[PDB]
Design a protein around this ligand. Structure first.
Ligand SMILES: CCCCCCCCCCc1ccc(-c2noc(CCCN)n2)cc1
Length: 415
């Protein structure tokens, strides 16, 4: 009877996790205008966070099997809450300290988002554990959008950008306490790596997920600032609209992907990768349309964001099924760990920084002006459709081997 509460508390903790992760982004314009840093600064913020997360994920996965998971989970929560709160008081002179703060929050968030799912899965039974793991990943995008919403609302209400970073730890501490109280104290991989690299459909799926992570990171970091620059040159609320859009489109896209796969599985055996490919094509088209619409009317830009976003997440969420079907269950843990690590390394661990770099390089080659700021950010973000198209081609390559590797996987698991 206690398990039904601990799952809810871990889900709320995850909501708060993503809330902080993206409230550092919903307030980006004020951070720049205060610290005086260029686009590469914000790129550095988000890329340092992700590069810390993707390196601290396998470590805290190792320390999860050896020592007890509850105390390390709560230590992680308290750590990233306290570090966010303590970085909310950084002077206008020090920016590297705010970046180091984002790095330490990355470590503290890796601990949680890596160790919590194991406890969720162990607290329940098969059907109910699947239900609860579904609630957890439903709580993911909710917090992902609440990030922008809370950041913008709090910044506007208090008139300062520090408050967006102040208001979350007061819930972080409460959740850490509740997890120390409620959650019960529940009790050679190189060969696997060589075999998985020998695999083909899994490798193409890994590169496709890496492309999706690239596009997701770059967009989710720079879209509010891009839209604000558009509104400025088109002579606050924009991040709020985008937060509502994403908080809806997460669920909407996972449901659309589920419907498409359940509809197409009967027509072709290589359905799921073709579903991901057509979703990638549509998302690339609508993302390319975002920027050409932003120059005229922002409502069309929002429509394009919503459509491209629901076509973007639909394909990535069902990649975990390809991974489970192709990998024999004896190496699934290492397969998913390697896939997450690679999708970060190639994806959103260098994507916000890369877009900041391109924006800076295009701006410095022309006269600085809000018009040119907006055009430079647009041209730099236009690199996202290219990576989305590459992910689509890699999903096609995945389809060209899905049946064969699934057959071999069934053969190996049957014996
Ligand atoms: C534009 C920047 C926005 C930033 C969004 C960042 C996170 C997006 C979340 C998308 C998502 C949703 C669900 C799942 C999932 N995993 O397992 C299951 C259970 C399977 C039951 N059929 N659902 C995974 C990923």
């Amino acid at each position: 009877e206690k398990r039904k509460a601990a799952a809810a508390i871990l889900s709320l903790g995850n909501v708060l996790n993503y809330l902080d992760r993206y409230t550092v982004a919903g307030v980006l314009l004020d951070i720049q205008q205060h610290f005086g840093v260029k686009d590469r600064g914000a790129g550095l913020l988000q890329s340092v966070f992700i590069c810390s997360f993707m390196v601290a994920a396998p470590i805290f996965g190792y320390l999860g099997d050896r020592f007890n998971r509850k105390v390390i989970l709560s230590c992680g929560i308290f750590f990233w809450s306290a570090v966010t709160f303590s970085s909310s008081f950084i002077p206008q002179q020090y920016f590297w300290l705010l970046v180091l703060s984002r790095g330490l929050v990355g470590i503290g968030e890796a601990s949680y988002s890596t160790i919590a799912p194991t406890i969720i899965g162990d607290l329940f039974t098969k059907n109910t554990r699947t239900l609860m793991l579904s609630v957890f990943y439903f709580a993911i995008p909710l917090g992902s959008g609440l990030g922008y919403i809370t950041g913008s609302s709090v910044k506007q209400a208090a008139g300062d950008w520090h408050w967006a970073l102040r208001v979350s730890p007061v819930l972080g501490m409460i959740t850490g306490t509740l997890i120390l109280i409620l959650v019960p104290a529940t009790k050679s991989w190189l060969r696997d790596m060589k075999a998985l690299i020998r695999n083909r459909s899994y490798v193409f799926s890994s590169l496709a997920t890496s492309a999706v992570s690239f596009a997701t990171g770059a967009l989710g970091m720079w879209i509010p600032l891009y839209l604000h620059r558009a509104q400025v040159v088109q002579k606050a609320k924009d991040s709020l609209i985008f937060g509502a859009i994403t908080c809806f489109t997460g669920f909407l896209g996972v449901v659309t992907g589920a419907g498409a796969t359940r509809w197409c599985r009967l027509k072709t055996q290589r359905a799921d990768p073709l579903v991901c490919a057509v979703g990638m094509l549509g998302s690339a088209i609508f993302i390319c349309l975002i920027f050409v619409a932003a120059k005229s009317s922002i409502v069309g830009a929002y429509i394009c964001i919503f459509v491209g976003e629901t076509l973007l997440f639909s394909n990535w969420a069902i990649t975990a099924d390809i991974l489970m079907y192709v990998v024999i269950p004896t190496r699934r843990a290492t397969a998913v760990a390697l896939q997450s690590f690679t999708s970060h390394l190639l994806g959103d661990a260098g994507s916000p920084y890369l877009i900041g770099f391109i924006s800076d390089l295009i701006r410095q080659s022309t006269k600085d002006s809000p018009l040119w700021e907006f055009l430079s950010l647009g041209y730099a973000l236009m690199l996202c459709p290219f990576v989305v198209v590459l992910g689509g081609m890699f999903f096609l390559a995945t389809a060209l081997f899905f049946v064969s590797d699934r057959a071999r996987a069934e053969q190996q698991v049957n014996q």
